[PDB]
Design an enzyme around this catalytic site. Structure first.
Site, PDB file in Angstrom:
ATOM      1  N   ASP A   1      -4.328 -36.886 -29.732  1.00  0.00           N
ATOM      2  CA  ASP A   1      -3.299 -35.915 -30.089  1.00  0.00           C
ATOM      3  C   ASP A   1      -2.536 -36.385 -31.317  1.00  0.00           C
ATOM      4  OD1 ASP A   1      -1.374 -33.977 -30.141  1.00  0.00           O
ATOM      5  OD2 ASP A   1      -0.282 -34.697 -28.377  1.00  0.00           O
TER       6      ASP A   1
ATOM      7  N   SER B   1       0.445 -26.308 -46.840  1.00  0.00           N
ATOM      8  CA  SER B   1      -0.691 -25.510 -47.267  1.00  0.00           C
ATOM      9  C   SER B   1      -0.262 -24.639 -48.448  1.00  0.00           C
ATOM     10  CB  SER B   1      -1.186 -24.634 -46.118  1.00  0.00           C
ATOM     11  OG  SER B   1      -2.210 -23.757 -46.556  1.00  0.00           O
TER      12      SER B   1
END
Length: 330
Positions: A35, A199
């Site tokens: 994770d 992004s």
């Protein structure tokens, strides 16, 4: 040194991925959920409330010659999905795919929430976010990666998750055969303890890419792609019959629909998520309505590039002094 381990979806929807991890001496192999959005390595154990164990493999520290109890230490974590677990703390020898860390903090669960109990395939979590998020008290403990880092040939790990198929976590090296084209690297902020990056925009299907900054985290421990409501609405508007259902808890669509791809930007490069990756199947058994793999992050407080996004890429988690993230198509 290096390590290389195969990671395998837990079910037919890629809800999560499990990777075998050797703990203790002699080794006890548990299947952990790696994770990159958390920083605790915790396991089902001989100390876990018996009624909260349902098919998991447990770690038994009393059978390990190398286990040591961290005196007085406790841990307690709550995840974004509302699940939780807590307990006490050992250190022990932990190996992943041939890479060994001695004295790794292995957090033994005394209590786990129902979602963990109900998932027989996941024996615990191995956190790979920054150690600043680790929940051990009174003294925070380091992640497996942080402990291994100085010994690695290169201070990196890579995630190469499969679509409905196994994939690979590598430590200490970049497998240049595992991706197409080049890796584009992008800046990371560690201010919130995550692999947080920006992004450069998105496209829906064959649409022209929209240049716009989207801050979010690379999180292997989250199933879906959670993005701003504007972006998500633009995606589902291109799917006939799709709608947001408060009853179901997100966007649903007719299972017969053809889903468009979704593209996200990494610098000037682009990662294309095929439409099929966005299908999470019938909302309930036998339904003709299907659950979408791109959902709004509104009310999470953060955008999350989870498995839906990451499995479309070869992803480098570069733990150099100034961390960065790399993405390549594959």
């Amino acid at each position: 040194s290096t390590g290389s381990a195969t990671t395998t979806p837990i079910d037919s929807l890629d809800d999560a991925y499990i990777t075998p991890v050797q703990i203790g001496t002699p080794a006890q192999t548990l299947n952990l959920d790696f994770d990159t959005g958390s920083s605790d390595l915790w396991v089902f154990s001989s100390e876990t409330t018996a009624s909260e164990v349902d098919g998991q493999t447990i770690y038994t520290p009393s059978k390990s010659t190398t286990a040591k109890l961290l005196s007085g230490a406790t841990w307690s974590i709550s995840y974004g999905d509302g699940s939780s677990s807590s307990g006490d703390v050992y250190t022990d020898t932990v190996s992943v795919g041939g890479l060994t860390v001695t004295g790794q903090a292995v957090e033994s669960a005394k209590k786990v929430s129902s979602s963990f109990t109900e998932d027989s395939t996941i024996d615990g979590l191995l956190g790979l976010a920054f150690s600043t998020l680790n929940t051990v008290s009174p003294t925070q403990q380091k992640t497996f990666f942080d402990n291994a880092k100085a010994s690695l040939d290169s201070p990196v790990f890579t995630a190469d998750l499969g679509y409905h198929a196994p994939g690979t976590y590598n430590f200490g090296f970049i497998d240049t055969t595992a991706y197409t084209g080049s890796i584009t690297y992008t800046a990371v902020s560690t201010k919130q303890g995550f692999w947080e990056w920006t992004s450069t925009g998105y496209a829906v299907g064959s649409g022209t890419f929209k240049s716009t900054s989207i801050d979010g985290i690379a999180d292997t421990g989250t199933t879906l792609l959670y993005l701003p409501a504007t972006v998500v609405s633009a995606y589902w508007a291109q799917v006939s019959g799709a709608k947001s259902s408060s009853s179901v808890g997100g966007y649903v669509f007719p299972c017969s629909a053809t889903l468009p791809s979704f593209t996200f930007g990494v610098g000037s490069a682009r990662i294309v998520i095929p439409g099929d990756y966005i299908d999470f199947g019938p909302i309930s058994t036998g339904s003709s309505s299907c659950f979408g793999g791109i959902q709004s992050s509104a009310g999470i407080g953060i955008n999350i590039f989870g498995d839906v996004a990451l499995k479309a890429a070869f992803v480098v988690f570069n733990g150099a002094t100034t961390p960065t993230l790399g993405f390549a198509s594959k």
